[PDB]
């Protein structure tokens, strides 16, 4: 939700506050950065990192997926 | 006070396609939008627009 790009603090370029919207008919709310930790998966090329909103990729890539898939046909 | 806006398209084929040297097509198309916005602001200041008063 809130992004800081201040030059003084090296903490620029990262979201400062977050929308969290779990659901269960309760209001989505706001969390400050300092309280939460985000966990990412496997590294990807930075041009993909930007389009994935700073989020990694699933370990089940399509090469592994169809390698699994053709086994059943076998 | 008024609001301004534009957009650009891009395809995964052209994104994946690489070139010899130079800025990427995405970066150039992003710079085009900024140039268009600045030029439109300058045109509004120096020439006006009759329908928008």
């Amino acid at each position: 939700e809130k992004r800081v790009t201040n030059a003084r603090s090296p903490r620029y370029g990262e979201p400062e506050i977050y929308k969290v919207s779990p659901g269960d008919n309760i209001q989505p709310y706001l969390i400050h950065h300092t309280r939460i930790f985000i966990a990412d998966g496997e590294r990807v090329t930075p041009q993909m990192r930007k389009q994935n909103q700073g989020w990694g990729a699933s370990v089940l890539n399509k090469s592994l997926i169809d390698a699994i898939c053709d086994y059943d046909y076998c | 006070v008024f609001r301004l806006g534009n957009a650009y398209l891009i395809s995964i084929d052209e994104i994946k396609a690489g070139q010899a040297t130079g800025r990427p097509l995405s970066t150039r198309k992003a710079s085009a939008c900024q140039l268009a916005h600045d030029q439109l602001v300058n045109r509004l200041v120096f020439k006006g627009s009759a329908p928008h008063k």
């Binding site: 590294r43 990807v44 090329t45 041009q47 993909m48 990729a57 890539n61 399509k62 090469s63 592994l64 | 994946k16 396609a17 690489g18």
Partner: peptide
């Protein structure tokens, strides 16, 4: 085909392994 090696890297997990096993283990040593 696939002249942009980034697509190859993020597509085939094998090339992923060849490119990332060495340096990451190197630093974690």
């Amino acid at each position: 085909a696939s002249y942009h090696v980034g697509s190859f890297y993020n597509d085939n997990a094998t090339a992923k392994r060849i490119v990332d096993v060495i340096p990451e283990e190197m630093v974690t040593a």
